[PDB]
Amino acid sequence: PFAMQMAYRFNGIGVTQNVLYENQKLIANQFNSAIGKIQDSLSSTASAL
Amino acid sequence: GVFVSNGTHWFVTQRNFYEPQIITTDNTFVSGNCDVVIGIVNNTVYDPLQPELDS
Amino acid sequence: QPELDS
Ligand SMILES: *[C@@H]1O[C@H](CO)[C@@H](O[C@@H]2O[C@H](CO)[C@@H](O)[C@H](O)[C@H]2NC(C)=O)[C@H](O)[C@H]1NC(C)=O
Ligand SMILES: *[C@@H]1O[C@H](CO)[C@@H](O[C@@H]2O[C@H](CO)[C@@H](O)[C@H](O)[C@H]2NC(C)=O)[C@H](O)[C@H]1NC(C)=O
Ligand SMILES: *[C@@H]1O[C@H](CO)[C@@H](O)[C@H](O)[C@H]1NC(C)=O
């Protein structure tokens, strides 16, 4: 499952895996907003390519 | 490791090899209560100290 | 600390 994979990936950077399970919806919201900001600041005329 | 289940009983294994064991308080740690984890499961956590030690 | 008491 995806949440268990992300919890194991928090162990690699030195955070215990209960920090993901206790903050799962906040982390999902921050990811879903960061992808949208990537899409916004790419869709406009900021030629980063 | 991870928690697994053979259909009825719950074990704990390592991630890269199947080697199940009995869930005690030496394979686990405790942080919080059971109303914030999405997908929690009722089971028994065995204690390796009380049933052998009385005196 | 207290839990060896019988
Ligand atoms: C799931 O694991 C449990 C734990 O080993 C199995 O229970 C054992 O079943 C055997 C039958 O072959 C008995 O001799 C043991 O005494 C049982 N152990 C305990 C602690 O009850 C159970 O059979 C497994 N289930 C499946 C479907 O494999
Ligand atoms: C897991 O265990 C808890 C603790 O017994 C269960 O919570 C109880 O559930 C019953 C039935 O819904 C309620 O009548 C009790 O008031 C609950 N007690 C507490 C302290 O929450 C929970 O339902 C169990 N979950 C499963 C899937 O078995
Ligand atoms: C996991 O998915 C099933 C359907 O595939 C769903 O019924 C269940 O509620 C899901 N588990 C959780 C904890 O939401």
Coordinates of all heavy atoms in Angstrom, one line a residue, chain B residues 1-26:
Chain B
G1 N 10.1 -4.0 10.8 CA 9.5 -4.7 9.7 C 8.0 -4.3 9.5 O 7.6 -3.2 9.7
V2 N 7.3 -5.3 9.0 CA 5.8 -5.1 8.7 C 5.1 -6.1 9.5 O 5.6 -7.2 9.9 CB 5.5 -5.3 7.2 CG1 6.1 -4.1 6.4 CG2 6.1 -6.5 6.7
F3 N 3.8 -5.8 9.7 CA 2.8 -6.8 10.2 C 2.2 -7.6 9.1 O 1.8 -7.0 8.1 CB 1.7 -6.1 11.0 CG 2.2 -5.5 12.3 CD1 1.9 -4.2 12.7 CD2 3.0 -6.2 13.2 CE1 2.3 -3.6 13.8 CE2 3.4 -5.6 14.4 CZ 3.0 -4.3 14.7
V4 N 2.1 -8.9 9.2 CA 1.4 -9.7 8.2 C 0.4 -10.6 8.9 O 0.4 -10.7 10.1 CB 2.4 -10.5 7.4 CG1 3.3 -9.7 6.5 CG2 3.3 -11.4 8.3
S5 N -0.3 -11.3 8.1 CA -1.4 -12.2 8.6 C -1.6 -13.4 7.7 O -1.8 -13.2 6.5 CB -2.7 -11.5 8.7 OG -3.8 -12.4 8.7
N6 N -1.5 -14.6 8.2 CA -1.7 -15.8 7.4 C -3.2 -16.2 7.3 O -3.5 -17.3 6.8 CB -0.9 -17.0 8.0 CG -1.5 -17.5 9.3 OD1 -2.1 -16.7 10.1 ND2 -1.3 -18.8 9.6
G7 N -4.1 -15.3 7.6 CA -5.5 -15.5 7.5 C -6.2 -15.4 8.8 O -7.3 -14.7 8.8
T8 N -5.7 -15.9 9.9 CA -6.3 -15.8 11.2 C -5.4 -15.0 12.2 O -5.8 -14.2 12.9 CB -6.6 -17.2 11.8 OG1 -5.4 -17.7 12.4 CG2 -7.0 -18.2 10.7
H9 N -4.1 -15.4 12.2 CA -3.2 -15.0 13.2 C -2.2 -13.9 12.7 O -1.9 -13.9 11.5 CB -2.3 -16.2 13.7 CG -1.9 -16.0 15.2 ND1 -1.1 -17.0 15.8 CD2 -2.0 -15.0 16.1 CE1 -0.9 -16.6 17.0 NE2 -1.4 -15.4 17.2
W10 N -1.8 -13.0 13.6 CA -0.9 -11.9 13.2 C 0.5 -12.1 13.6 O 0.7 -12.5 14.8 CB -1.5 -10.6 13.7 CG -2.7 -10.1 13.0 CD1 -4.0 -10.5 13.2 CD2 -2.7 -9.2 11.9 NE1 -4.8 -9.9 12.3 CE2 -4.1 -9.1 11.5 CE3 -1.8 -8.5 11.2 CZ2 -4.5 -8.3 10.4 CZ3 -2.2 -7.7 10.1 CH2 -3.5 -7.6 9.8
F11 N 1.4 -11.7 12.8 CA 2.9 -11.9 13.0 C 3.6 -10.6 12.6 O 3.0 -9.7 12.1 CB 3.4 -13.0 12.2 CG 2.9 -14.4 12.5 CD1 2.1 -15.0 11.6 CD2 3.1 -15.0 13.7 CE1 1.5 -16.3 11.9 CE2 2.6 -16.2 14.0 CZ 1.8 -16.8 13.1
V12 N 4.9 -10.6 12.9 CA 5.7 -9.5 12.4 C 6.9 -10.1 11.7 O 7.5 -11.1 12.2 CB 6.1 -8.5 13.5 CG1 6.8 -9.2 14.7 CG2 7.0 -7.4 13.0
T13 N 7.3 -9.6 10.5 CA 8.4 -10.2 9.8 C 9.4 -9.1 9.3 O 9.1 -7.9 9.6 CB 7.9 -10.9 8.5 OG1 9.0 -11.4 7.8 CG2 7.1 -10.0 7.7
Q14 N 10.5 -9.4 8.7 CA 11.3 -8.4 8.1 C 10.8 -8.2 6.6 O 10.1 -9.0 6.1 CB 12.8 -8.9 8.1 CG 13.0 -10.4 7.9 CD 14.4 -10.8 8.0 OE1 15.3 -9.9 8.0 NE2 14.7 -12.1 7.9
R15 N 11.3 -7.2 6.0 CA 10.7 -6.7 4.8 C 11.2 -7.5 3.6 O 10.5 -7.6 2.6 CB 11.0 -5.2 4.5 CG 10.3 -4.3 5.6 CD 10.6 -2.9 5.2 NE 9.6 -2.0 5.9 CZ 8.5 -1.5 5.2 NH1 8.3 -1.8 4.0 NH2 7.7 -0.7 5.9
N16 N 12.4 -8.1 3.6 CA 13.0 -8.7 2.5 C 13.1 -10.2 2.5 O 13.6 -10.9 1.6 CB 14.4 -8.2 2.3 CG 14.5 -7.0 1.4 OD1 13.7 -6.9 0.4 ND2 15.4 -6.0 1.6
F17 N 12.6 -10.8 3.6 CA 12.6 -12.3 3.7 C 11.4 -12.7 4.7 O 11.2 -12.0 5.6 CB 13.9 -12.7 4.3 CG 14.2 -14.2 4.1 CD1 14.6 -14.6 2.9 CD2 14.1 -15.1 5.1 CE1 14.9 -16.0 2.7 CE2 14.4 -16.4 4.9 CZ 14.8 -16.8 3.7
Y18 N 10.8 -13.8 4.3 CA 9.7 -14.2 5.2 C 10.2 -15.0 6.4 O 10.8 -16.0 6.2 CB 8.7 -15.1 4.4 CG 7.4 -15.4 5.1 CD1 6.8 -14.4 5.8 CD2 6.9 -16.7 5.2 CE1 5.6 -14.6 6.5 CE2 5.8 -16.9 5.9 CZ 5.1 -15.9 6.5 OH 4.0 -16.2 7.2
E19 N 9.9 -14.5 7.5 CA 10.4 -15.0 8.8 C 9.5 -14.6 9.9 O 9.9 -13.7 10.7 CB 11.8 -14.6 9.0 CG 12.6 -15.5 10.0 CD 13.7 -14.8 10.7 OE1 13.6 -13.5 10.7 OE2 14.6 -15.4 11.2
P20 N 8.3 -15.1 10.1 CA 7.3 -14.5 11.0 C 7.6 -14.8 12.5 O 8.2 -15.8 12.8 CB 6.0 -15.2 10.6 CG 6.4 -16.5 10.1 CD 7.8 -16.3 9.5
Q21 N 7.2 -13.9 13.3 CA 7.5 -14.0 14.8 C 6.2 -13.5 15.5 O 5.3 -13.0 15.0 CB 8.7 -13.2 15.2 CG 10.0 -13.9 15.0 CD 11.1 -13.0 14.9 OE1 11.0 -11.8 14.7 NE2 12.3 -13.5 14.9
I22 N 6.3 -13.7 16.8 CA 5.2 -13.4 17.7 C 5.3 -11.9 18.1 O 6.4 -11.5 18.5 CB 5.1 -14.3 18.9 CG1 5.3 -15.7 18.5 CG2 3.8 -14.1 19.6 CD1 4.2 -16.3 17.6
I23 N 4.2 -11.1 18.0 CA 4.3 -9.7 18.3 C 4.4 -9.5 19.8 O 3.5 -9.8 20.6 CB 3.0 -9.0 17.7 CG1 3.0 -9.1 16.2 CG2 3.0 -7.6 18.2 CD1 1.7 -8.9 15.6
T24 N 5.5 -9.0 20.3 CA 5.7 -8.7 21.7 C 5.9 -7.2 21.8 O 5.8 -6.4 20.9 CB 6.9 -9.4 22.3 OG1 8.1 -8.7 22.0 CG2 7.0 -10.8 21.7
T25 N 6.3 -6.8 23.0 CA 6.7 -5.4 23.3 C 8.2 -5.2 23.1 O 8.8 -4.2 23.6 CB 6.3 -5.0 24.7 OG1 7.2 -5.5 25.6 CG2 4.9 -5.4 25.0
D26 N 8.9 -6.2 22.4 CA 10.3 -6.0 22.0 C 10.4 -5.9 20.5 O 11.6 -5.7 20.1 CB 11.1 -7.1 22.6 CG 11.4 -7.0 24.0 OD1 10.7 -6.2 24.7 OD2 12.4 -7.7 24.5

